Design a protein around this ligand. Structure first.
Ligand SMILES: CCCCCCCCCCCCCCCCCC(=O)OC[C@H](COP(=O)([O-])OCC(O)COP(=O)([O-])OC[C@@H](COC(=O)CCCCCCCCCCCCCCCCC)OC(=O)CCCCCCCCCCCCCCCCC)OC(=O)CCCCCCCCCCCCCCCCC
Ligand SMILES: CCCCCCCCCCCCCCCCCC(=O)OC[C@H](COP(=O)([O-])OCC(O)COP(=O)([O-])OC[C@@H](COC(=O)CCCCCCCCCCCCCCCCC)OC(=O)CCCCCCCCCCCCCCCCC)OC(=O)CCCCCCCCCCCCCCCCC
Ligand SMILES: CCCCCCCCCCCCCCCCCC(=O)OC[C@H](COP(=O)([O-])OCC(O)COP(=O)([O-])OC[C@@H](COC(=O)CCCCCCCCCCCCCCCCC)OC(=O)CCCCCCCCCCCCCCCCC)OC(=O)CCCCCCCCCCCCCCCCC
Ligand SMILES: CCCCCCCCCCCCCCCCCC(=O)OC[C@H](COP(=O)([O-])OCC(O)COP(=O)([O-])OC[C@@H](COC(=O)CCCCCCCCCCCCCCCCC)OC(=O)CCCCCCCCCCCCCCCCC)OC(=O)CCCCCCCCCCCCCCCCC
Ligand code: HEA
Ligand SMILES: CCCCCCCCCCCCCCCCCC(=O)OC[C@H](COP(=O)([O-])OCC[N+](C)(C)C)OC(=O)CCCCCCCCCCCCCCCCC
Ligand SMILES: CCCCCCCCCCCCCCCCCC(=O)OC[C@H](COP(=O)([O-])OCC[N+](C)(C)C)OC(=O)CCCCCCCCCCCCCCCCC
Ligand SMILES: COC1=C(OC)C(=O)C(C/C=C(\C)CC/C=C(\C)CC/C=C(\C)CC/C=C(/C)CC/C=C(/C)CC/C=C(\C)CC/C=C(\C)CCC=C(C)C)=C(C)C1=O
Ligand code: FES
Ligand code: FES
Lengths: 47, 63, 153, 20, 99, 243, 50, 53, 113, 188, 57, 49, 52
């Protein structure tokens, strides 16, 4: 059960740390798209 | 003679300073390098001319 | 012989661009195995006759220049490209890609150059049936001729 | 002189006769 | 026009760090035009190097290598039994060096 | 040619003549700074205000993007050697142009490294500053510049910082950031150059912060309250860590 | 050549030549090694052809 | 044009004159060279106010 | 005592730990050597942080900051894992160059930066 | 100057002593530093007036200096005659004038070129109570001058540490490696 | 062939005369440089002619 | 003459506005110079010249 | 590699020429260490051609 919450601080942190680290790729894509809004169209045309 | 050079090189390679295992590996690598140099000198083909003027001087491992 | 060397190199390039079929690939595999066993991975100086030793060493040096050095150059070019990419990415100098990427490029490029120039190395070992190396070369040539349903020198 | 040529191609062997 | 969107008004003297190009010559405060300056001294290094050492020590070898690549070192074809035929030597006379 | 009349040309001629007739060598100024404390000058009549070892504290060999520039050379050399693109003779020879030009930017960077002032002194009268610098080859250049020719730049180096209200010294006296200053006219090796930019690295001790700030801002320092200390602790061509 | 063209001009870095007279005694001998090697090579090749 | 202090020049060479120090400062030499020239002139008795011909 | 006097102060603490262990915990069953190993590993974490700071002080401010975050995570400081995860998420693949020289040309080379 | 005056309150001065240290603690002939207070400014500055600044003691150049027992610091920077010492046989009780400037044409001993070169380094006149072989310094930086104390090794190390000295040493190294590689690849 | 050595001595002396001095570039100086450049090749070709086997051709 | 007119118009624009700092600033500066009213008249007159 | 072998380097310079070109002489080694590689390799190729 593990009713206490503070006593599982490491587990609670690691619960979201993996997701936050995994979100690196998406954040970089969003930043690149914001920096170069025309990049999407340019790459689509080239492809 | 030159064990102090390992400590001196910590200026550019702090890994030796902060990891004595690295310094031991470096010393072993130096010993192995000298070993390989000697083995190359005395065992490698090191082809040379068959000239009486210099045969047997170890300039070439002809014999 | 510079004309002959250029013609042979161009023929090899044209064949590589063309590609190979099952029989050609099998013959090339046999020739490459023979060359690696008897020349590349063997000390040529250990043969019996001076003529066979000298010709085997000539073949080994030709293989070196046409395969090993070329693969080293191409792998170094690839490793340098990767090094430039990583240097731009990290805004600093990196040393890891040089050895690893160079070794990977050499491993990738050695098989293709060996396939391209397998026939030349095999043919350069035709010292003659009077010697062990020439006899093994003739045996492999007979096997390849049987496989390919053709005759070669 | 001693090493004026700076290199010798000892690898190049005497051409082997290939007559029948 | 006094209002341009992209441009930024020039209300002050810009520093030398904004210059795309570095001047070679200069002026003394008494009006003398200096052509020889430390900028020229540092600029003349690569040109003199090319003129003196690298071109003179690599040109002939490059030429010979290209000649062998593209012209078979001037070999005359239509010959028989290269083993008996004479060898057409690669370029050996340094044309860059005064003969 | 003079018979052709142009108002712009006439204005230029009038401006030149008026400038020549009006502005003289002697120029009046009122930017005089009186330091609170008495100045202790060396035996040579100079007071040290800045010291640093820019060569020691700077990166010389592995500096981006010069490492990239020089690491691109082997690719060109290999391309020329092996002709992977099946080019003509002239086309392949064109690949050898890069190695002859790929090391110039590193040379320029090394040259710029010598403009980082190693030491600065203020002379008697508070009107002349001697800047001593050294190059990577050990050559030492000392140049004297009048104080009014200094102009500090902002922390971004893209503009001139206000001389009056310039914030480049910490509260205690040290430099907040590497301070760039442009000298209008610098006489180096007996040659005068225009708009010479120099830098004082933050990794350098600053002596007499008031005097340093006055020199940077271009004030004339009043050295009436001065004392002379006889200390022959410095020898000619003295060695240092700035190598 | 580079040093003379870059620094030895009066404008950049003239040097006060205080030396009165030369004092070389064997610099000629030291320098003549190179022409000596030239002569040795010439003699060797010529004699081998002869 | 960076003229050194004539009083400083006089202090470094005690026996030199103010007029001589000022003339040396007016002469276009770097301050170190000005001090050295003042020292040499005082030690030799050379007349700095002489136009060489 | 003499070894302690001659030993550098940076690893004097490690020497003290080793001496105390060799004297007392070698002969004691209840003393777990894993705890001593963990203490030595914490000291080694500090040493590695200092080493990496020295190595990358003049090259990668971002890398040294990331390694400081990693050292905090290893030491298990409050919020260390969360801040490390945020830094990783916000970390660019092509990190900007932050060591431009003041005297170095920047107008033409800013594209690479 | 308002901002400068305001910040002067919290501005702090730092000592102007650097790696060269103080010469009076290492040179017997260098007097301890003394501060001289200028007199009051002259109300009238006559064209032909002389300095009223207090006089400074004048120490002439000695002809020679005694042997410093391991505490020798050359007055000027001497020429590096050599990077390794001279193994010279000294006689008992014979006075030797070791060269300090480093340009002497008579070897380790003074030849007189110190008087002809601009330098404050004076010859060291010394005597030995026991005849025999001694290593006399040649780099002229030994703290135990005239006797070598292996300071030439540290001078060589500093030369190698310098950017240009490193380049020169390793350029010569690779030049010799050129011969070595030519010999190694002579047969091909 | 032995005659070549004094020419080398003169060449090295000329080269050393240009170092560590106050240069005053002038047309006579440029003519001197051109003279040196021509003389080097001239003497080198003479030394080559001294080669007996090459001298035959 | 087209090159001369372009260079002179660029100088005229730069005397009142800061010179380009990067490629984008240079591109917009060139576009503004091209669309300048004075530039077109100068180009026409110098083409006649 | 020259003056280093001599324990009187000033004497070395004076007795050779009384001139100082040591800076250029010792800087030239770095350039001379590689200015010869293409020539050496082409000479090896030419020697092999002569042998053939
Ligand atoms: C039949 C064949 C036909 C072929 C086609 C021909 C077509 C026609 C071509 C016509 C070309 C016209 C060119 C006009 C130039 C006008 C310059 C001018 O007026 O400047 C005044 C200037 C003084 O102005 P100032 O107001 O006193 O300056 C004060 C400022 O504080 C100091 O200034 P600043 O630091 O503030 O800088 C301001 C900056 C403005 O700020 C900027 O820089 C902003 C713009 C950034 C982008 C830069 C260019 C990007 C790439 C495109 C460039 C296209 C160039 C096309 C023309 C090339 C040929 C010239 O503007 C400039 O100063 C000039 C910059 C111009 C660009 C220079 C770089 C060119 C690179 C070319 C790369 C290769 C391109 C290949 C293309 C494909 C086809 C070949 O003095 C000069 O003119 C000096 C020029 C020096 C040039 C040479 C430098 C190197 C010297 C070493 C020798 C190298 C050559 C050896 C001999 C080789 C031949 C034997
Ligand atoms: C007037 C001149 C005009 C010239 C033309 C135009 C030039 C461009 C425009 C600029 C014009 C002039 C004006 C310049 C203004 C100033 C610009 C400036 O300073 O900013 C710099 C500017 C970025 O600064 P910024 O504009 O401030 O933006 C900040 C960035 O967003 C910060 O970066 P970030 O962290 O946000 O990164 C975002 C990321 C967005 O992308 C991603 O997030 C995806 C990344 C996937 C990586 C793979 C692994 C993914 C999973 C990793 C998981 C973790 C494990 C560890 C991973 C470690 C890292 C790998 O960006 C990328 O990586 C984009 C690359 C996409 C390329 C296409 C890939 C698919 C097709 C490939 C076809 C084949 C190409 C062969 C090329 C061969 C070349 C020899 O530079 C760049 O954009 C850098 C681009 C990437 C480096 C260049 C080389 C990339 C390709 C390398 C290929 C290597 C060989 C591959 C062989 C494959 C064989 C099968
Ligand atoms: C394939 C390679 C792979 C390599 C991989 C990488 C390897 C990494 C290795 C890392 C470590 C490398 C270390 C390199 C050091 C470089 C720096 C250095 O040494 O300079 C510091 C050096 C400091 O010197 P020091 O250690 O303080 O010693 C100063 C003492 O005054 C010196 O005086 P002393 O107290 O030493 O006295 C010497 C001698 C003085 O007596 C003599 O006159 C010598 C000859 C005695 C007769 C011996 C007969 C046998 C045949 C001798 C043939 C040569 C004699 C020529 C005599 C000419 C006389 C005009 O003493 C005597 O009175 C006679 C004693 C005889 C006892 C017999 C012992 C058994 C036979 C061996 C005898 C060797 C004698 C020394 C020879 C020295 C060269 C001439 O700084 C300098 O001042 C530099 C000076 C210029 C140096 C130029 C040469 C540079 C290279 C030296 C190292 C050679 C290494 C070669 C290795 C080759 C391997 C393939
Ligand atoms: C006009 C326009 C047209 C022109 C057309 C073209 C031209 C035509 C011209 C025709 C006429 C030609 C005329 C020819 C004559 C010209 C003469 C003239 O004008 O010059 C007068 C010029 C005057 O002399 P100088 O050059 O001023 O004298 C200074 C020296 O030459 C400079 O040498 P230095 O030694 O005194 O200074 C450098 C010194 C600076 O260094 C020092 O002194 C420092 C102390 C030494 C030790 C330093 C290192 C200490 C390290 C400590 C430990 C560090 C930490 C540990 C790190 C490692 C371990 C972890 O370096 C050393 O001593 C140490 C170097 C050691 C490197 C060698 C070791 C090789 C092995 C290394 C192996 C390593 C890898 C292992 C791999 C194994 C497996 C493969 O030359 C002459 O005296 C006349 C020469 C006449 C010919 C004879 C040449 C031989 C005699 C000696 C001189 C040779 C060099 C100079 C030759 C001249 C050209 C460069
Ligand atoms: C000014 C006139 C002049 C000078 C100075 C010389 C100088 C020399 N001459 Fe010559 N010679 C002639 C004018 C001159 N000569 C003429 C007119 C004829 C033909 C006459 C007729 O038949 O009508 C002739 C013919 C002639 C022959 C006969 C060729 C033949 O008939 O086949 C030979 C043979 O050795 C010779 C040798 C030399 C030598 C060794 C020198 C030496 O003095 C040269 C020594 C100098 C050097 C050797 C320079 C060293 C070089 C350097 C330091 C630079 C090195 C740099 C590089 C290699 C890059 N000369
Ligand atoms: C103090 C002064 C000292 C002076 C010393 C005396 C110097 C004498 C030599 C001077 C040489 C000057 C340079 C010549 C360059 C010749 C290049 C050439 O054609 O290639 C030769 C060689 C010949 O190659 P090849 O393959 O054609 O061979 C010759 C022909 N076959 C094949 C038949 C043998 O080619 C190369 O080197 C290829 C790479 C060249 C890369 C550099 C090109 C430079 C182009 C000229 C400079 C740039 C233009 C603008 C210059 C502006 C100047 C202000
Ligand atoms: C290119 C490859 C290398 C070739 C090397 C060729 C040289 C081979 C060795 C020659 C030895 C004989 C030289 C005679 C001329 C000098 C005589 C002399 O002055 O001696 C007294 C000097 C004494 O010098 P000193 O400075 O101590 O004392 C003289 C000063 N007074 C007069 C005030 C006392 O002894 C030496 O230092 C001998 C040095 C011998 C080495 C050659 C020196 C010239 C520079 C080239 C160095 C090359 C090193 C090669 C090493 C060996 C390689 C196999
Ligand atoms: C390793 O590197 C090296 C080498 O290897 C490459 C070497 O070979 C060498 C050896 C080299 C040498 C010893 C030097 C060799 C010679 C050199 C470098 C110089 C050669 C120069 C040339 C060939 C250029 C040709 C010379 C010229 C004068 C060309 C002139 C051209 C032009 C267009 C001018 C034409 C004009 C006219 C004819 C006159 C018309 C005008 C008038 C009559 C007057 C008009 C007047 C009015 C008023 C209108 C060295 C040193 C080296 O370092
Ligand atoms: S001390 Fe060196 S010459 Fe008198
Ligand atoms: S030679 Fe000066 S200390 Fe050894």
């Amino acid at each position: 059960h593990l009713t206490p919450k503070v006593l599982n601080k490491a587990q609670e942190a690691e619960k979201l740390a993996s997701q936050i680290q995994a979100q690196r790729f998406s954040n970089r894509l969003v930043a690149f798209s914001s920096q170069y809004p025309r990049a999407k169209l340019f790459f689509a045309g080239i492809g | 003679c030159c064990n102090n050079y390992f400590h001196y090189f910590e200026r550019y390679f702090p890994r030796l300073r902060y990891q004595p295992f690295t310094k031991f590996l470096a010393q072993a690598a130096t010993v192995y390098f000298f070993f390989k140099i000697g083995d190359y000198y005395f065992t490698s083909r090191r082809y040379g001319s068959n000239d009486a003027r210099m045969n047997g001087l170890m300039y070439s491992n002809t014999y | 012989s510079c004309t002959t060397r250029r013609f042979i190199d161009e023929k090899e390039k044209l064949e590589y661009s063309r590609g190979y079929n099952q029989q050609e690939l099998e013959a090339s595999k046999l020739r490459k195995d023979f060359v690696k066993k008897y020349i590349v991975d063997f000390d040529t100086t250990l043969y019996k006759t001076q003529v066979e030793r000298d010709w085997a060493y000539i073949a080994k040096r030709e293989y070196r220049y046409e395969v090993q050095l070329k693969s080293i150059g191409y792998g170094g070019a690839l490793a340098n490209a990767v090094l430039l990419w990583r240097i731009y990415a990290n805004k600093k100098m990196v040393f890891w890609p040089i050895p690893i990427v160079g070794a990977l490029g050499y491993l990738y490029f050695q098989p293709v150059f060996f396939q391209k120039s397998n026939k030349r190395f095999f043919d350069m070992c035709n010292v003659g049936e009077e010697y062990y190396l020439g006899r093994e070369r003739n045996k492999i040539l007979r096997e390849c001729n049987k496989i390919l349903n053709v005759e070669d020198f | 002189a001693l090493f004026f040529m700076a290199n010798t191609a000892i690898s190049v062997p005497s051409v082997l006769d290939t007559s029948p | 026009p006094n209002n341009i969107k992209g441009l930024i008004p020039k209300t002050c003297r810009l520093p030398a760090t904004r210059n795309w190009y570095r001047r070679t010559s200069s002026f003394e405060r008494n009006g003398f035009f200096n052509i020889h300056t430390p900028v020229l001294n540092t600029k003349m290094i690569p040109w003199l190097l090319f003129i003196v050492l690298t071109w003179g020590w690599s040109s002939f070898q490059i030429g010979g290598y290209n000649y062998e690549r593209f012209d078979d070192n001037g070999e005359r074809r239509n010959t028989l039994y290269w083993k008996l035929s004479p060898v057409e030597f690669p370029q050996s006379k340094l044309w860059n060096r005064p003969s | 040619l003079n018979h052709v009349q142009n108002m712009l040309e006439e204005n230029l001629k009038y401006d030149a003549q008026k400038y020549n007739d009006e502005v003289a060598v002697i120029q009046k100024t009122s930017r005089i700074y009186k330091p609170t404390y008495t100045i202790e000058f060396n035996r040579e009549g100079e007071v040290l205000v800045y010291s640093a070892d820019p060569i020691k504290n700077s990166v010389v060999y592995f500096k981006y993007p010069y490492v990239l520039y020089e690491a691109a050379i082997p690719l060109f050399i290999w391309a020329w050697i092996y002709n992977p693109l099946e080019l003509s003779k002239n086309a392949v020879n064109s690949l050898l142009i890069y190695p002859n030009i790929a090391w110039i930017p590193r040379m320029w960077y090394w040259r710029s490294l010598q403009y980082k002032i190693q030491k600065m002194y203020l002379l008697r009268g508070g009107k002349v500053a001697k800047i001593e610098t050294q190059s990577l080859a050990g050559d030492r250049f000392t140049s004297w510049v009048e104080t009014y020719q200094f102009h500090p730049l902002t922390q971004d180096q893209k503009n001139f910082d206000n001389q009056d209200n310039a914030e480049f010294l910490e509260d205690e006296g040290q430099l907040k950031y590497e301070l760039g200053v442009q000298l209008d006219n610098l006489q180096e090796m007996g040659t005068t150059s225009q708009d010479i930019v120099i830098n004082f690295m933050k990794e350098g001790t600053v002596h007499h912060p008031e005097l340093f700030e006055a020199i940077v801002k271009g004030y004339n320092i009043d050295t009436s309250d001065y004392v002379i200390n006889t200390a022959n602790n410095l020898r000619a061509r003295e060695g240092n860590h700035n190598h | 050549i580079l040093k003379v063209a870059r620094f030895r001009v009066l404008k950049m870095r003239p040097k006060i030549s205080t030396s009165y007279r030369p004092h070389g005694k064997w610099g000629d001998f030291l320098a003549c090694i190179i022409p000596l090697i030239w002569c040795i090579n010439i003699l060797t090749n010529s004699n081998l052809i002869l | 044009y960076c003229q050194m202090d004539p009083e400083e020049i006089m202090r470094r060479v005690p026996g030199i004159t103010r007029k001589e120090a000022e003339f040396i400062t007016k002469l276009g030499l770097s301050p170190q060279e000005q001090v050295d020239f003042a020292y040499i002139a005082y030690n030799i008795g050379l007349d700095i106010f002489y136009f060489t011909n | 005592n003499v070894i302690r006097a001659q030993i550098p102060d940076e690893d004097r603490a490690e020497f003290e730990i080793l001496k105390k262990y060799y004297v007392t915990g070698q002969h004691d069953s209840l003393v777990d050597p894993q705890d001593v190993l963990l203490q030595l590993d914490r000291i080694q974490v500090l040493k590695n942080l200092k080493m990496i700071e020295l190595n990358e002080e003049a090259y990668d401010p971002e890398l040294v900051r990331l390694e400081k975050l990693k050292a905090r995570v290893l030491l298990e400081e409050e919020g260390a894992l969360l801040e490390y995860a945020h830094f990783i998420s916000k970390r660019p693949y092509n990190k900007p160059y932050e060591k431009w020289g003041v005297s170095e040309e920047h107008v033409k080379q800013q594209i690479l930066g | 100057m308002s901002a400068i005056l305001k910040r002067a309150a919290k501005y702090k001065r730092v000592s102007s002593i650097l790696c060269e240290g103080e010469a009076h603690l290492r040179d017997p002939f260098t007097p301890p530093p003394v501060i001289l207070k200028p007199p009051a400014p002259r109300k009238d500055k006559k064209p032909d007036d002389i300095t009223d600044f207090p006089a400074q003691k004048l120490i002439p150049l000695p002809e020679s200096i005694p042997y410093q027992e391991g505490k020798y610091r050359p007055a000027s920077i001497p020429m590096v005659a050599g990077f390794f010492p001279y193994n010279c046989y000294l006689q008992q009780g014979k006075v030797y004038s070791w060269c300090s400037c480093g340009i002497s044409q008579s070897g380790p001993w003074c030849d007189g070129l110190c008087n002809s070169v601009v330098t404050r380094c004076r010859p060291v006149v010394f005597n030995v109570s026991q005849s025999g072989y001694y290593k006399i310094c040649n780099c002229k930086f030994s703290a135990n001058a005239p006797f070598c104390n292996n300071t030439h090794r540290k001078m060589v190390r500093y030369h190698h540490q310098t950017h240009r000295g490193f380049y020169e040493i390793w350029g010569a190294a690779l030049f010799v490696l050129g011969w070595v590689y030519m010999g190694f690849n002579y047969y091909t | 062939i032995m005659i070549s050595m004094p020419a080398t001595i003169k060449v090295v002396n000329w080269t050393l005369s240009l170092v560590n001095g106050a240069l005053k570039i002038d047309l006579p100086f440029l003519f001197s440089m051109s003279f040196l450049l021509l003389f080097l090749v001239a003497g080198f070709t003479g030394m080559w002619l001294s080669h007996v086997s090459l001298n035959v051709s | 003459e087209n090159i001369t007119a372009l260079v002179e118009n660029c100088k005229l624009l730069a005397t009142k506005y800061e010179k380009p700092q990067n490629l984008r600033q240079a591109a917009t500066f060139m576009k503004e110079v091209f669309k300048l009213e004075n530039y077109r008249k100068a180009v026409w007159n110098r083409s006649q010249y | 590699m020259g003056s280093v072998w001599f324990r009187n380097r000033y004497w070395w310079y004076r007795s050779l020429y009384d001139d100082y070109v040591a800076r250029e002489a010792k800087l030239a080694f770095g350039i001379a260490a590689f200015i010869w590689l293409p020539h050496y390799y082409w000479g090896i190729h030419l020697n092999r051609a002569f042998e053939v």
